[PDB]
Design an enzyme around this catalytic site. Sequence first.
Site, PDB file in Angstrom:
ATOM      1  N   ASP A   1       0.814  -1.204   0.000  1.00  0.00           N
ATOM      2  CA  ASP A   1       0.000   0.000   0.000  1.00  0.00           C
ATOM      3  C   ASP A   1       0.853   1.261   0.000  1.00  0.00           C
ATOM      4  O   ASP A   1       1.762   1.389   0.789  1.00  0.00           O
ATOM      5  CB  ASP A   1      -0.903  -0.007   1.231  1.00  0.00           C
TER       6      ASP A   1
ATOM      7  N   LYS B   1      -0.489   4.566  -0.376  1.00  0.00           N
ATOM      8  CA  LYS B   1      -1.386   5.703  -0.370  1.00  0.00           C
ATOM      9  C   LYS B   1      -0.655   6.885   0.221  1.00  0.00           C
ATOM     10  O   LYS B   1       0.198   6.719   1.081  1.00  0.00           O
ATOM     11  CB  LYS B   1      -2.679   5.410   0.399  1.00  0.00           C
TER      12      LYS B   1
ATOM     13  N   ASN C   1       0.053   6.925   3.655  1.00  0.00           N
ATOM     14  CA  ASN C   1       1.117   6.053   4.124  1.00  0.00           C
ATOM     15  C   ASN C   1       2.467   6.726   4.237  1.00  0.00           C
ATOM     16  O   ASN C   1       3.237   6.428   5.130  1.00  0.00           O
ATOM     17  CB  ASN C   1       1.226   4.822   3.234  1.00  0.00           C
TER      18      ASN C   1
END
Length: 261
Positions: A118, A120, A123
């Site tokens: 992930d 994003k 993040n």
Amino acid sequence: KIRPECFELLRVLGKGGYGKVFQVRKVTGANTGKIFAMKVLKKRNILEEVKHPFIVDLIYAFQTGGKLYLILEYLSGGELFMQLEREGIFMEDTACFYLAEISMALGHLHQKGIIYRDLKPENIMLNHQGHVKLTDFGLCKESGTIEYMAPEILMRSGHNRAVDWWSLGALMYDMLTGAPPFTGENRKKTIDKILKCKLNLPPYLTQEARDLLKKLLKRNAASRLGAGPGDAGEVQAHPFFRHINWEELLARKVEPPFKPL
Ligand SMILES: [Cl-]
Ligand SMILES: [Cl-]
Ligand SMILES: [Cl-]
Ligand SMILES: [Cl-]
Ligand SMILES: [Cl-]
Ligand SMILES: [Cl-]
């Protein structure tokens, strides 16, 4: 010794997956008054075995039933997402610098057998200097005859480095256009779009950006950039990144586009 009692909670940085993250001040020891982030589990080795400029450091780890406490370095820079939505879209160069740093972090992890999955903007975090720091390691994989075997099976699809490289493209796309490559009215619809993966590239992008996205954002993992034995090397060698000096970048000697305050 170190105990929960050792730390004072200033505020809550984030509620997480079965995990909360605090901002704490050390009230005990030589580092008293020092500021840290505390992550707690209701019931580690990964973080310890990585000491990178672009990855969050781990200072202390300890266990009390039923809870596990992780003491990490505090990052004032916070989310990159904040910077994103602040403006609407990063300039290509601004995007390149962040993307370049992330590539180095991804490269390190991959060597270490770790996949982020992930990427994003939520993040990605920044340090005081404003450099990239990669944070959460909870949802992170830990990587007779074959003739009639599926391609996906052969390449360990879904659990290989390629997945991260895709995510980088989506992130790059988001930075450049202000929106993610595939978006839906709803989750099921959005998922289907991602699977269909008919990429649409805005006119305003450079050849370099468009080419990279096409290479990063391609459904077949094997043909994806960075999918190869080269890993981050393949991506870094791309004309998008021609300007970067990696030694300088690694040194964090390259001035960040945004310096918090
Ligand atoms: Cl640091
Ligand atoms: Cl520019
Ligand atoms: Cl090693
Ligand atoms: Cl692999
Ligand atoms: Cl084209
Ligand atoms: Cl395909």
